[PDB]
Design a protein around this ligand. Structure first.
Ligand SMILES: N[C@@H](CCC(=O)N[C@@H](CS)C(=O)NCC(=O)O)C(=O)O
Ligand SMILES: N[C@@H](CCC(=O)N[C@@H](CS)C(=O)NCC(=O)O)C(=O)O
Ligand SMILES: [Zn+2]
Ligand SMILES: [Zn+2]
Lengths: 217, 217
């Protein structure tokens, strides 16, 4: 019946997609692959009709996609959240790119042993990165236009992951904190987050020294 | 008068932009940062009017962008290459994501001392990735539609870099070689590749162990 979103049973790259789906209210099924389901994925991989096999994937009948940003932009596009002029469309793609980097910064250091060493320079850098994001947000409720878009769920997830790594870093910018609360207050987001479905943990792949494991440390 | 692309004087993330710009004739000047211009950049960084400062950038009057894919898409959009329906748009974004992944597989190991060890499993996985790309392209001349797009220059650059790392990986796929030759024969691209301004080297940032340094070994 309903479209499928396949991903590891983790937050990671798919969580902004789930948040967007939930916020716009579109029906979907998740096909989760748990920590011990590596081989199940291997069996499905070349077998789902996908043109560029990967996780996450997204299947709706005949139509299928991979690449998390493409999936997210597909849903976004349905709600006219990707811009209407070359200038605006570009601006949105820049925002996405920066948000991809914001998230990936955490991922780049989370999978190696020396994470606690790497954390040190990371936090030296972070405040300017965050400052950049807080000036870009400014006094607006959302990153672009005046209602939530996929950029906002991207940004929320990144922030939330990063607050976890160091709660005070994000806490130093009032507008980012108020943003975090703004999104958590969105009724479909709140309901989702309070539901059976919601995946609080892990933030990254299970094998991560930070954001990994079956539960928080 | 002319728009400005700014980047390190390397191939890297900018090469497909440059290739696209030279293919369509969107006239431009290139503000180049050399190996020893770290300080230069640091100082322009916050005084170029950039909302999200970063390399590469693109300035065109009052308009500016960062994010390599965003710049790429801005130009492509102006030339009708990012699709016209939500489905087509979404597939194009999927192909982009796959292509960024393909280029990044090189970058993720090339900067590490340990590159020659990491090379070995990279080359074990590589044949399966190239197979995916080879079948996705099939008998078509170009990745999407019937004329060159930004995807085809992202793809060309990724494959050229990979061929350099391991020629016969790519030569095992005749359709991929024909694609490389097809791009190289486009008259605008050819004249470009033969010009003084072209950058043949380095592939990655100078400080890299694969595709780094001021010239090939
Ligand atoms: N750029 C891709 C990266 C996807 C990716 O690397 N996915 C990983 C986990 S986050 C995976 O398990 N891929 C499946 C596979 O390698 O077969 C995206 O955004 O989707
Ligand atoms: N996701 C960005 C990455 C940008 C990036 O990492 N740029 C590096 C060089 S590859 C840089 O020098 N950034 C400028 C800076 O960090 O100040 C893109 O695609 O443009
Ligand atoms: Zn809808
Ligand atoms: Zn033109």
């Amino acid at each position: 019946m309903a479209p499928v979103l396949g991903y590891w049973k983790i937050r990671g790259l798919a969580q902004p997609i789930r948040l967007l789906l939930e916020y716009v209210g579109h029906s979907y099924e998740e096909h989760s692959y748990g920590r011990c389901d590596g081989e199940k994925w291997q069996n499905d991989k070349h077998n789902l009709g996908l043109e560029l096999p990967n996780l996450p994937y997204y299947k709706d009948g005949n139509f299928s996609l991979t690449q998390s940003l493409a999936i997210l932009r597909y849903i976004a596009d349905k709600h006219n959240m990707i811009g209407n002029t070359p200038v605006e469309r570009a601006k949105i793609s820049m925002i996405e790119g920066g948000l991809v980097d914001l998230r990936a910064g955490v991922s780049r250091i989370a999978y190696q042993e020396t994470f606690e060493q790497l954390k040190v320079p990371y936090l030296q850098q972070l405040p300017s990165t965050l400052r950049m994001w807080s000036q870009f947000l400014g006094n607006n409720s959302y990153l672009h236009g005046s209602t939530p878009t996929h950029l906002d769920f991207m940004f929320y997830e990144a922030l939330d992951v990063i607050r976890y790594l160091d709660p005070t870093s994000v806490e130093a910018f009032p507008n980012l904190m108020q943003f975090i609360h703004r999104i958590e207050a969105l009724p479909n987001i709140k309901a989702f987050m309070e539901s059976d479905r919601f995946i609080k943990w892990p933030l990254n792949g299970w094998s991560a020294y930070f954001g990994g494991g079956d539960a928080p440390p």
